[PDB]
């Protein structure tokens, strides 16, 4: 009842019983007729108008990203191409744990409150052209866990890596994909997940592995 | 700025260590914008909520000082975390405190000198006046959690639970703004990920898990 | 059980068994975060600043009012003094109905929400210087259901009556004793226990006895 | 300006017997205001439910006439309200609903000529542009749940909940304004206390009641 | 740099350098997130409500004056046709500072801030079917100007021919031309723009002509 | 209604010369208004500035009475204005303190009756003090109809002097003494009766001679 590392071992780490409770840790999103619900619309709208701005460009970019580019687009951020061809241990690491961060740090809440996404609530579409589960974020989620266990290899750049993982959380902002609240909330679950894959032990090996690699080249 | 060369039991960073606060995080809600308007309102719940049963366990949570944070977990880790009964994992979370509380929220801290709740409306707290964004405590109580649940996977949940609610507390208190606190859980998670870089804490944290095992 | 005409029959006509259920009515009050409590305390503001005008003279008046002085406040509204000396009939059919209105028709919401009162609020006193139970208000409830059963008596003055009566509920607004939330709702509540009133051979009986006395 | 005397089967009033809406009500909240920020929140929240039961319900509700409201109580009322099952009752019910939904709301319906939700956004509804405070038919279904429950009080918080969530579905369904059925509660009870004094009215009610009795 | 009176001598009475500096002078436009700017949508919404009133006729009126027409939109006010054929004087001195109020006044603060036009950001049409620029208001500074000047002319009717001017900026809100913060703001620069035309000599030349033209055409 | 009839060293305009405020001002924000939820607002920021520099300032403009405003533009001006330094400038000024402290703004001050807030907030402000004819500011009203004329006297400083105006009024908000609407409101009305001055014999005679006395030096 649910996809896990028993299904899909490249690309979960973690099984159904060893996922974080996003329903029980996150609050509820904000409900529409509260002050709260009133900003998530107001951040959308300046979000909007940024859709024309450069920081608009990068912000559809990023929209096309699908979970496997994640880590590819941090290259920048971290220094050097994240690529299976210029660091298959550590394209790999991150590769094998975008569901237990997208998906299992998630699900719980997701299915629960099946909030409908910005672009839906408005009827019109997003930066870049499941109208449901938009909180919280699956995709930020994934972003931000990436950036702490980036920043573990590369702390000499941690502050461009963090800066890189918050940011791909904004551009679904801005694009229309979220409410800020989504992603806010997905920052929350995404850095409990990796506390969980650091007592696995097949991540340990690849983190090592990661590690060595990177000191490597 | 103090850091591990200056207080060696209370930072396992150096200064040169340390997150960027200013530039990872977003400018606290400035008074006259809808943020700040929910801000208001998320302190006027935590003051009514001061005299149920959640208020109780809030003034509770006010009056631990970082020193306590540890042995606050106890319960949700499912033992005493005490000097006495687990010296190893004591010594682990001790040491980290300032890195998590001070390092990691020093500079936007510093920057914005937000003024606090009960400063603000000029009335005492459930239990300085500035340095409000982000909390020091929630970054400490939140980097923690974040640490003991690598420790008791088993109990990750309950963990993580207390520690996203100690920053609550001090929402519910008047010590700070509902930014205040959401603020500190990204920086706080953030030091983790720098903590797991550093060598000594490496070395207690393998040693704290021993210890669990024993 | 509660209070009801089993145990003061001469404040209630209705039992236990026969009120409404407000909980299950009304829908909660505005919770604090939402944009209607924002609308709440922009009203108590509005009413703080009357407190100086004539209206907030009236407001403290009424504010005085205790539950037994409810029906004789609409004497001016009716047209004559409803006293116990001047309308005994009158003065009993209102009477004996306050804690249905009052009581009965808030109770089950009033104890489940618990909800704060302004000048608890605030910290601050009143205008006419119990914490909780505020919504909905009891008074308000009584207020409403008085003058929908003395419109019936006189409808030649219905509007005259019933502004009085929608007037009740509001100084309760501008002396700080409820949000206007609460009084709003105390209306659909207190037109309520009045259909039920309507079922009541005692409530009949008076009530026809009250109209014939207005005739003479 | 209708009443009794011009279609004495839909009302039971004069026009001098009406309630003053515009004297009584508090004017509707004014775009600019915080009460107004309410209702627009209310409006969208009554938006996404009409993909829900409650939003199917709405729709349903939406396509009642003020004929059909009578009827629409059946369920609450625990037996068919039906000129062929109870016409004592469905006389009773019919020939006020213009005392409800009209002289009572007249005054200041016309005087407001409030814009309605659906014609403000420029958008369909779930199912006249203005008038829209206070709700007329909101007023009707108010003023009948408090008669029928003087009937049948073994059920008057069915009756009760039923008569209310008739208005809440206009709301659900973009024909009105939060502020406009709260409104047309506190009009559509006085013109109830109206109804009560009205001879043909009250021979009615006795009818009506006893034809309940019977059955 | 851009436009001024060495440029188009008869648009303008001043120079770039006497320019008021608007950008220094304004506080900056609502940000969207801010309760000043909810407030500006929500006086978008009562215009636009507006549009179909005897009101929003006016309005959608006013929002066909183009500069060269705002002076002659005030003869019902001032008490006279404003045209050139009626009061040459009085119209060449109206016309002459149309984008000293206009543009030099404006200027700095609305290429700075490149403030989006409500129909642009609601992304429907206006009442009277560019999309920055909007803070502050160049129409309403000249409209504005030319009013505070007008109301010298003739004091005896000063508050009809203020309210006037007052008048033609609520159109553009009612019309969505502009955000209600966008005229409030033109006003300011369009008072200051007068005063600097009292310092030039141009200017004083035409203002005595246009008053010695206001006492003939009385008798 | 004093006038120049009654003042004529305050006043250059008669009662019937007067700007009709009531007419020409749209009411004040009321309370339950989004707008009074801003000025609120404004009212909480200018609080928390009173311990900063521009407080201190603030402070100091809020103990100017109508006779020290003209003083206020020395340092902007460029050169003291004191009646020692600048006797027919300083004399153009101050006879035209009211005509724009109280006539502009008379019609609608005492219309609406609007409370300050201070008094609402039944707070002390940051400098006997009256609590209502808060809408429009008679102070800003002065301040900025003097800035216009200064800034017609002198135009190579008309930005330094024109910021100076505007700050006075700010200052009031700052302090508590009004509300933002009320300085806004101010600055409309205070423009408004710089056009009366310029059609008045008497003001024309000083500002003529305040001129040529500027030139002198």
Redesign the interface.
């Known amino acids: 009842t649910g996809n896990d590392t028993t299904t899909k071992p490249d690309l979960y780490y973690l099984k159904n019983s ?1 996922a ?2 996003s329903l ?2 996150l609050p509820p999103p904000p409900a ?8 998530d619309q ?2 959308y ?2 979000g909007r ?1 940024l859709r024309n701005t450069e920081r608009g460009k990068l912000a559809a970019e990023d929209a096309n990203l699908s979970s496997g580019d994640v880590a590819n687009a941090f290259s920048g951020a971290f220094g050097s191409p994240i690529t299976e061809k210029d660091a298959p241990a550590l394209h790999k690491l991150l590769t094998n744990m975008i569901e237990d961060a997208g998906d299992l740090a998630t699900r719980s809440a997701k299915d629960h409150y099946m909030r ?1 996404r910005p672009f839906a ?1 408005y009827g019109v579409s997003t930066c870049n052209t499941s109208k449901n589960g938009s909180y919280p974020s699956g995709h930020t989620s994934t972003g931000w866990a990436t950036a ?2 980036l ?2 290899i590369n ?1 000499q750049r ?2 461009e890596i ?2 890189r993982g ?1 940011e791909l959380g904004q551009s679904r902002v801005i694009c229309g994909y979220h409410w800020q609240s989504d992603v ?1 909330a997905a ?2 679950v995404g ?2 997940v ?3 894959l ?2 696995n032990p097949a991540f340990q090996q690849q983190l090592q592995k990661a590690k060595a690699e990177f000191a490597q080249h």
Not at 32 to 39: E, P, Q, T
Request: proline residues 2%.
């Open positions: 060893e974080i409770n029980a840790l529409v007729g509260s002050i709260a619900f009133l900003n107001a951040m709208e300046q108008l409908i609530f702490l266990v920043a573990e702390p941690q502050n963090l800066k918050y806010d920052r929350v850095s409990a990796v506390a969980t650091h007592t």
